[PDB]
Amino acid sequence: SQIVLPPHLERIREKLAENIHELWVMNKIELGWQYGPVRDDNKRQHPCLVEFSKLPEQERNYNLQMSLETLKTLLALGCHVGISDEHAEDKVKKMKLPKNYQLTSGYKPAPMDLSFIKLTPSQEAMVDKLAENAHNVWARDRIRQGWTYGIQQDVKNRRNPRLVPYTLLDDRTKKSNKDSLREAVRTLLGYGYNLEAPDQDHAARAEVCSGTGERFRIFRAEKTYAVKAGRWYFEFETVTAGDMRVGWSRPGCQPDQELGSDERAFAFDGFKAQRWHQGNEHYGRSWQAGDVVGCMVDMNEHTMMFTLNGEILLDDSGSELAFKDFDVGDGFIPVCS
Ligand SMILES: Nc1ncnc2c1ncn2[C@@H]1O[C@H](COP(=O)(O)OP(=O)(O)OP(=O)(O)O)[C@@H](O)[C@H]1O
Ligand SMILES: COc1ccc2c(c1)CN(Cc1ccc(C(=O)O)cc1)CCS2
């Protein structure tokens, strides 16, 4: 609603509407649809493919309004549009088409050639965005209808399995809508209107989003199994590669606080390659899927060391000790976050 129409698009909008309408009757003839008097899908002969004048003026207006909304959403996409030159409209080349491919209309709908016209990756990305929004407005119209999703298509029960996000939509519709959208935006370029898109933005979730406010879960051995002397080894296999920590915690570790943030636990975050105890340092490399990190503690001279896939992880210095010295205290137990 907030979108205002610039004067160039304003006085070119009717030509856009009619040319894309003719372009659609070209898409129809390419798909094999032929022109007829009456609206009956079985007979494949409809007045829809004939020129807009013989088209029902209701559908013709509804198509033009649909394009007004589509170009307004294009402008809402943050993409600026600039007319190239007046001569790009003064000379309007138009491929000739075979009579079987060509409509009864004398002048060929086919605008300046798609070979000459070029599509950038950003332009294709905004084509995808526009296809997304068109399906959204198609769906909201259905919700106003009261149609609700159904795996089986139903008209009496108004259950369309096409009421899913465009990401999960079936290929055939995605292709047909994409074709009309991208040939439309290519006609936009061929009219000299250059669509300079906004810069692509990068954002990272970093596992902030979570079901339930809880950010992480800690699994540990029982307190009674604490080891106060000897040399011990246990493995941790990482099915994924994310915010995961493994190491040894005291029987006083808190299940709400992250490992290594306090003095209770000594952990290794392979995600950021950091050893964690009362802070973070740099230690080791980053793991991948199906990586086995073995944690080893020798409580005799108070050392702890980690081996990712067998090789010994190292800090910035060549030392193999993740934590050089620590008090025995009340023992250590295997712990993971
Ligand atoms: N003959 C046409 N002329 C113009 N645009 C059309 C035409 N057919 C389809 N469209 C466009 O493509 C969309 C396809 O909607 P369509 O009515 O085919 O969906 P549907 O799944 O059959 O709907 P419902 O859920 O009500 O059964 C329309 O919203 C419109 O934008
Ligand atoms: C530019 O505007 C138009 C004008 C005409 C047509 C399309 C888009 C493309 N679309 C594709 C499509 C197919 C199935 C569904 C559906 O059943 O959900 C929705 C859209 C309708 C077929 S011709």
UniProtKB/Swiss-Prot annotation:
Summarize the disease involvement recorded for this protein. Ventricular tachycardia, catecholaminergic polymorphic, 1, with or without atrial dysfunction and/or dilated cardiomyopathy: An arrhythmogenic disorder characterized by stress-induced, bidirectional ventricular tachycardia that may degenerate into cardiac arrest and cause sudden death. Patients present with recurrent syncope, seizures, or sudden death after physical activity or emotional stress. CPVT1 inheritance is autosomal dominant.
- Which parts are the sequence repeats? 1-97, 98-211
The record's subcellular location field reads:
Sarcoplasmic reticulum membrane
Please give the tissue specificity annotation from the record for this chain.
Detected in heart muscle (at protein level). Heart muscle, brain (cerebellum and hippocampus) and placenta.
Q: Which family does it belong to?
A: Belongs to the ryanodine receptor (TC 1.A.3.1) family. RYR2 subfamily.
What name does the UniProt record give this protein? Ryanodine receptor 2
Q: How is it modified after translation?
A: Channel activity is modulated by phosphorylation. Phosphorylation is increased in failing heart, leading to calcium leaks and increased cytoplasmic Ca(2+) levels.
> Residue limits of the B30.2/SPRY domain?
156-337
Highest taxon of the lineage: Eukaryota
The UniProt comment on domains reads: The calcium release channel activity resides in the C-terminal region while the remaining part of the protein resides in the cytoplasm.
Q: Which section of the whole protein is represented?
A: 870 to 1206 of 4967
